[PDB]
Structures are given as structure tokens and as C-alpha cells.
Design a protein around this ligand. Structure first.
Ligand code: OP8
Length: 107
């Protein structure tokens, strides 16, 4: 599944709801912490709408448990990420992933 570990607290009150657009900054790492992507590197917050099947399962479930302003480390098992397929050249088959995510706002 997904483990959610707080890096910095949010407001503890305002959580994503289906149909809202989550605006986040993230860094994606392989299991050992090696970075493969970051929205921070491109100076571009990432937006996705909850309930629209736009993201891997670990994000859909993990980000929903974050409150606005929170930073969290999401450790996502392969079944909740890219599974057996992986994503050739970026994500190995059967990879556990770690994302640092900051929930900036809901739009
Ligand atoms: C069409 C191009 C469109 C896109 O990729 C949309 C797509 O849905 C994205 C949002 C989705 C993802 C790749 C789903 C798969 C669909 C196939 C299905 O089999 C898979 O199931 C297991 C899941 O991403 C995710 O769920 C997760 C969680 C949210 C953050 C991104 N995610 C990551 O894992 C990353 O960090 C990663 O580096 O992000 C980059 C990134 O581009 C720099 C994507 C956007 C920022 C840019 C966008 C919108 O422009 C693309 C990505 O590039 C191709 C490779 C991955 C490894």
C-alpha cells in the first residue's frame, strides 16, 4: 500500500475531496532515495483532480490523507505504483517508490 509519514504538518482540518484539484510540489525517488523527478526542478506545481483516475493509486490514497500545507513522505509499494511493468528507463519493474509531497492548495 502506501505509508504516509509527515515531514511538516498541514492545517489538520482541510483534506482533499473528490472533484477538487490538488496542487502539489513533489520529488519522486526510487526505494533507495535516488531522485527520478521533481516538480520543484521545473518550477511548476503539479495539479491533479481527485477521483479522476489521473495518478497512481498510492497518490490517490496518500494525498487524500494530507491536509493543506502538509509535507509528507509517501512510501508506495509496487502494487500501488507501476507494478510489474514499471516504466522502462525511469521506474524499474517491481519498484517501491518514495515521494516527498507538499499539498500547497486545493482549487
Ligand atoms: C500524457 C503525459 C502526462 C502523463 O504522464 C499523465 C499521467 O497520468 C501521470 C500524471 C501519471 C502516470 C505516469 C500514470 C501512469 C499511466 C499508465 C498506467 O499504466 C500507470 O499505472 C501504474 C500509471 O503520473 C503519476 O501518477 C505519478 C504521480 C503524480 C506525479 C507524476 N507521477 C510520477 O510517478 C512521476 O513522478 C513521473 O516521473 O512523472 C512524470 C511526469 O512528467 C515529467 C508526469 C506529469 C508531471 C507530466 C504530465 C501531465 O504530462 C505527463 C511521468 O512522465 C511520463 C513519469 C512518472 C514516473
Amino acid at each position: 500500500g502506501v505509508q504516509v509519514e509527515t515531514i511538516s504538518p498541514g492545517d489538520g482540518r482541510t483534506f482533499p475531496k473528490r472533484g477538487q484539484t490538488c496542487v502539489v510540489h513533489y520529488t519522486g525517488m526510487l526505494e533507495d532515495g535516488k531522485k527520478f523527478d521533481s516538480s520543484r526542478d521545473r518550477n511548476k506545481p503539479f495539479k491533479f483532480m481527485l477521483g479522476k483516475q489521473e495518478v497512481i493509486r498510492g497518490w490517490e490514497e496518500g494525498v487524500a490523507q494530507m491536509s493543506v500545507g502538509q509535507r509528507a513522505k509517501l512510501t508506495i509499494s509496487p502494487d500501488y505504483a507501476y507494478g510489474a511493468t514499471g516504466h522502462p528507463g525511469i521506474i524499474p519493474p517491481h519498484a517501491t517508490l518514495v515521494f516527498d509531497v507538499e499539498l500547497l492548495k486545493l482549487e
